[PDB]
């Protein structure tokens, strides 16, 4: 019995589907103020975090819940993406268990945070001469924000115990404040666009996660195959057979797997066990 072992292993998966367009979240024309941030929700797609990591254009990519390199292996039910613009000296506040005026009651991250945060400097779009007054932030609030809560009300904050009646006055502050984004500003006062991905694992089946890595096929050699999960060994060769449109693999007499269709060319292959004995 010349029971040899396969030369190597080959994995083959279907073609890359919809590319899950993050491009409208990172290359958007205008972001939102930190007090009113976007929460675009992702769904069934193929998320490619690889380009995000090796982009060589971001300043902060500190990632908390999961390892950056395992992003393409773990698979999640749903993914969110928050987006806003803040100052340089304030990006340090976008982290679990942090305090300040823009992390405490502008954007609170939970302690058990599992997603992670991206931020890059853009002092060429959000900063114009004379000031860019399209970017506001709240600096007064009755109470602290609980994690992942949005507040956009603009009732005049009453600091004291006097009635205030909707106008500014003694101990009546306007809740919001503007960023004086001027080109001539040192780092730490310049705008910083921030995107916060928050992966969710809900009781529903996972629909959003990374692409599978296929490899080139080999014929008439003994290898270890993996076609959409089913694994084993055997020679792969063409066969004058047919499968129904919806059926991927067949099971022979004595109920064993005998032929599988590779999900790249829709071509039928027979898994003949490598000659033994």
């Amino acid at each position, epitope marked *: 019995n010349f029971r040899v072992q396969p030369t190597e292993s080959i994995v083959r998966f279907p073609n890359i589907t919809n590319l899950c367009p993050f491009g409208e979240v990172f290359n958007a024309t205008r972001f939102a103020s930190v007090y009113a941030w976007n929460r675009k929700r992702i769904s069934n797609c193929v998320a490619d975090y690889s380009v995000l990591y090796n982009s060589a254009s971001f300043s902060t990519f500190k990632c908390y819940g999961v390892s950056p390199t395992k992003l393409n292996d773990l698979c999640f039910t749903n993914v969110y993406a928050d987006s806003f613009v803040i100052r340089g000296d304030e990006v340090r506040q976008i982290a679990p268990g942090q305090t300040g005026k823009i992390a405490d009651y502008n954007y609170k991250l939970p302690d058990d945070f599992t997603g992670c945060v991206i931020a890059w400097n853009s002092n060429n779009l959000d900063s114009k*001469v*004379g*000031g860019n*007054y*399209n970017y*506001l932030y709240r*600096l007064f609030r009755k109470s602290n924000l609980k994690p992942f809560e949005r507040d956009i009300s*603009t009732e*005049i904050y009453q600091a004291g115990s006097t009635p205030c009646n*909707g*106008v*500014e*006055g*003694f*101990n*009546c*502050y*306007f809740p*919001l*404040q*503007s960023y*004086g984004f*001027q080109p*001539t500003n040192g780092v730490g006062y310049q705008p910083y666009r921030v995107v916060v991905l928050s992966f969710e694992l809900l009781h529903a089946p996972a629909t959003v996660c990374g692409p599978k890595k296929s490899t080139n096929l080999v014929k008439n050699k003994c290898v270890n195959f993996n076609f959409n999960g089913l694994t084993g060994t055997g020679v792969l060769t063409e066969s004058n057979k047919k499968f129904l449109p919806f059926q991927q693999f067949g099971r022979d007499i004595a109920d064993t797997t005998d032929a599988v269709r590779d999900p790249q060319t829709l071509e039928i292959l027979d898994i003949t066990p490598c000659s033994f004995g």
Partner: antibody
Amino acid sequence: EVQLVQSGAEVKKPGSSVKVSCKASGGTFSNYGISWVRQAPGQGLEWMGRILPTFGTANSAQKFQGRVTITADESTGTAYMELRSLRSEDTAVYYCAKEGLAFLGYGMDVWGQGTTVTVSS
Amino acid sequence: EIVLTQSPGTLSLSPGERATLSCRASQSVSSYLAWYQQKPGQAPRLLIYDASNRATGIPARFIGSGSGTDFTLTISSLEPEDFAVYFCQQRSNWPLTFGGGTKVEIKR
């Protein structure tokens, strides 16, 4: 760069009304915050009130309440400081200057030009 | 109603010396104090905001300090266009009161 073009000198009479405008040169308003400052002849500066143009909030100092009324026209980008019951001591040079959204912090960085209001009989 | 008071009243010096103005606050503005410069027949312009931040375009010789109720604006090297009236405003809370003024003269 923002500019604040203002009206011209207006000689008035006691007991009459004056309406000073402070048009923003460059189009319309934004999240600016505009405050009105007057300076008596040969004296210091005095702060009267401020308006939030886009958020629709405006009132004046307790000394000037019931007499001043600051309004804005976001379409034309023009803010007004109508002042009633003009008194002989109300003659001054009235300014308008943007100061940033909230009232604590930055300060008035872009000023108007001055609107001399001479009130006599 | 916070009352600001500047000192001294005129502070006349010579070109090239060092100036020192004070804006002793009455109450206790945290650190919100703006310094303005008004030349005769002109509009005031902002110099120092938040008591330590230099406004855009202002030369580096204007330096501000202080916190609480005692502040100070210091001009390191006077120049012929540095002689004007200097006002200080507290942007703590309603109403933003101004100060007296200081007509920096020329000595001879």
